[PDB]
């Protein structure tokens, strides 16, 4: 229940069983802290939160002090003042005078709280000197300047509890206590870059963002991660026309102060192989062209072909925003084509789940639903690779509750214990009626997560009716008023948005027609069978990759960092990206490339301001007008007609469920262009702990150095 208490006179209403520092926050009182983090276990090591409590002879650590029904807390008494100066004097006695060479400079909690709660000068002048410690090699991404360690334990707590990667520790004793693996090892965790943000000081910094910028010079934009389907909320820090770093911003509904390594380091892949001008393939060589006469040769080729119904095909890639889907949907429709394919294999045929009910393809018990999950069945998903931050949230619930996890699919290296039931569809039918099924039947708030990797499995029609028929058999537990145990997990930020606007192949008939013309709209992971060789290929994108290699025209669009695109995450939340920079070269906004080629093909799409194109999106799906919120699905029971009724006679073949992510580091074109992910893969493969693995710096075998980064 609620206890009541006074802090600096003022009554605060905090739940019983919480710490005092939590009530000080709720009461509007700033309490200095270093070790305590809202999302990490309580540690009382720093001693910077020492407050004065009535009926207590010593200062108490507020972070670890539970709130009681009647206590009095003075946070500004002379007891508190001399406590904070004394700790700030100890925290700075052995601290290296490395603020000009430190990357944490200008954004350091040790600096700010020294200015606010410390003394103005220091009393440490020992002829014997300060402590000094050697540096530690803990993989390519993290640079270590360990003299700066203040021993908060925030990273050992994060790596051991949130990341499930217990290789970081604390060896030694007393003043000679040190943070790092005793034997040099490469921190192997797709969440390991969060340690850099968690560090109060710059003892853990990022090797890519080594000495390039100062925090004060960065323009900060609150945008969305599109490198995965979860839609993680981020901050894009840029100095002029170059993105410097990508940080995590709080959103407890999605990502909770955490981002994965791909979404943090792939931004160096935004300045390396960019398409900056229109290209035409002439005599087998890509020639530069203007817009007026690359859009012309689009039209001339289209007139020459004179395609019939559905002979004009579009394939939408995995970084494509909803605005350009709706625009390309229209221009496709005015050309007599409903051939609206998607990048993944099986995406040029209709999907086993429909798109008629929104609940068919969404993560229906929202991401926040895991916080109360009791039993979870994972089907066709290695969530550590497909949805990293989501995987962590599963472990957080597992570590604190009686959560049972079972998986059907390919075994993976998991940060939580899970039962393996099998790899094929029979091993799902045998599980869902086996011992683990009664766990789903008995446990309240059950959760079945179906990976988007089964949608591309040949047996998905059988897989999807197997799952939902169990859900429909087991309602009032799976299908209560506020709960839905059916959840489909996207791994690309474009899939839920395409499904929302109906950007899919409608019928098997349109699927079998050979196209004479393919618009690869940011599509680069297309299966070769889905593009006929002799067709006319337009590639619209931002990075030169497989798609541009085969194109007949290349049209440069915008990356997600210089457009305000609409994206829908796997839970159905409609979020908006904010442009942090402008367009490079002659690139153009993606929806505008579609709208212009409407003039050149003679069917101009009506809207010609993006405000108008958002009014059109509202007609297709009104949820797309609601921002930063999930709109609940009303007819959630109507989902049986696609999942079970239209999936009744399924030609099961027995092929096992396949892995979808061969390389977590190389998933998209932004990632594959990134030098940092190049080093992350190479270090992973060869197990190299050296920070300067393919980077500037002196080595045993490089006395002279090296200017290559990423090679």
């Amino acid at each position: 229940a609620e206890v009541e208490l006074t802090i600096d006179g003022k009554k605060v209403s905090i739940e019983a069983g919480s710490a005092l520092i939590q009530a000080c926050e709720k009461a509007g009182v700033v309490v200095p802290r270093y070790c305590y983090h809202e999302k990490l276990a309580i540690a009382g090591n720093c001693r910077m939160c020492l407050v004065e409590v009535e009926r207590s002879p010593k200062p108490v650590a507020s972070c670890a002090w539970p709130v009681q029904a009647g206590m009095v807390v003075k946070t500004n008494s002379p007891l508190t003042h001399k406590a904070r100066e004394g700790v700030m004097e100890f925290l700075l006695a052995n601290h290296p005078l490395d603020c000009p060479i430190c990357d944490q400079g200008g954004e350091c909690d040790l600096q700010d709280q020294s200015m606010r709660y410390g003394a103005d000068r220091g009393r440490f002048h020992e002829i014997g000197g300060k402590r000094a410690v050697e540096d530690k090699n803990i993989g390519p991404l993290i640079k270590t300047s360990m003299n700066r360690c203040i021993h908060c334990t925030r990273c050992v707590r994060f790596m051991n509890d949130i990341a499930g990667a217990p290789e970081l520790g604390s060896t030694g004793r007393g003043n000679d206590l040190q943070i790092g693996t005793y034997l040099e090892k490469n921190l192997d965790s797709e969440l390991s870059g969060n340690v850099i943000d968690l560090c109060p000081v710059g003892a853990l910094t990022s090797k890519p963002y080594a000495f390039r910028a100062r925090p004060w010079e960065l323009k900060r934009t609150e945008s969305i991660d599109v490198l995965d389907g979860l839609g993680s909320n981020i901050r894009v820090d840029s100095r002029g026309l170059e993105v410097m770093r990508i940080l995590p911003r709080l959103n407890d509904d999605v990502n909770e102060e955490w981002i994965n390594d791909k979404t943090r380091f792939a931004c160096d892949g935004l300045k390396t192989q960019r398409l900056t001008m229109p290209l035409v393939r002439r005599d087998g060589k890509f020639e530069p062209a203007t817009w007026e006469q690359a859009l012309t040769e689009i039209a001339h080729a289209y007139q020459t072909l004179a395609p019939k119904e559905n002979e004009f095909k579009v394939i939408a890639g995995q970084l494509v925003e909803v605005e350009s889907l709706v625009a390309m949907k229209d221009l496709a429709n005015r050309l007599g084509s409903e051939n609206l394919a998607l990048d993944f294999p099986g995406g040029s045929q209709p999907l086993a789940h429909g798109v008629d009910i929104r609940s068919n393809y969404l993560f229906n018990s929202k991401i926040w639903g895991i916080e109360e999950a009791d039993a979870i069945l994972l089907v066709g998903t290695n969530p550590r690779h497909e949805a990293a931050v989501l995987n962590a949230r599963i472990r957080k619930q597992w570590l604190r509750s009686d959560l049972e996890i079972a998986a059907v699919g390919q075994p993976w290296e998991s940060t939580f214990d899970y039962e393996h039931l099998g790899t094929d569809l029979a091993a799902l039918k045998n599980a869902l009626s086996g011992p683990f099924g009664e766990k789903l039947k008995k446990a309240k708030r059950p959760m079945i997560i179906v990976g988007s990797g089964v949608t591309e499995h040949p047996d998905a029609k059988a897989f999807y009716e197997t799952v939902w028929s169990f859900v429909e058999k087991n309602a009032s537990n799976f299908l209560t008023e506020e709960w839905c145990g059916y959840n489909v997990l996207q791994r690309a930020a474009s899939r839920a948005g395409a499904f929302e606007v109906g950007f899919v192949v409608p019928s098997p008939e349109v699927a079998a027609t050979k196209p004479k013309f393919v618009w690869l709209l940011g599509a680069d992971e297309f299966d070769p069978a889905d593009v006929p060789k002799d067709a006319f290929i337009v590639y619209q994108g931002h990075h030169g990759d497989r798609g541009a290699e085969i194109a007949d025209i290349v049209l440069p669009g915008a990356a997600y960092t210089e457009k305000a695109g609409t994206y829908v995450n796997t839970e159905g939340r409609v979020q908006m990206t904010r442009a942090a920079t402008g367009l490079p070269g002659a690139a153009r906004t993606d929806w505008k490339i579609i709208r212009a080629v409407s003039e050149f093909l003679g069917v101009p799409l009506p809207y010609d301001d993006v405000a108008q194109l958002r009014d059109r999106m509202a007609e297709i799906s009104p949820a797309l007008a609601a921002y930063d919120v999930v709109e609940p699905v009303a007819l959630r029971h109507l989902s049986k007609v696609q999942l079970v009724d239209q999936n009744k006679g399924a030609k099961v073949t027995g092929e096992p469920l396949k892995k979808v992510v061969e390389n977590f580091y190389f998933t998209d074109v932004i990632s594959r262009s990134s030098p940092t992910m190049a080093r992350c893969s190479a270090a992973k493969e060869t197990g190299d702990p050296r920070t300067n693995f393919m980077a500037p710096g002196m080595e045993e075998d490089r006395p002279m150095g090296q200017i290559a980064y990423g090679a």
Binding site: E309, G336, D356, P506, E619
Partner: protein, 88 residues
Amino acid sequence: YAFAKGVKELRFLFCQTSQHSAEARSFLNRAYPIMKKHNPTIPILLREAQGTIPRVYARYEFGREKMESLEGLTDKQIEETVAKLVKT
């Protein structure tokens, strides 16, 4: 009974719990599963949002689209209105 050939996609826009959408919500809970059994080659998208005045959108070839509202209409009256949109 199917939809007339030349119809490409039906789109019902309504609200999850508004009173203005209960009649539309009643229609689809009794209509859509039969509407999908007859012709599975057509998408029939049900898209809702808080405070969505009920609407229906019928698309045909070349991207021609018709919108008839549904406010005030009873459960019965909807069926003829959709029939007008899907019969030729």
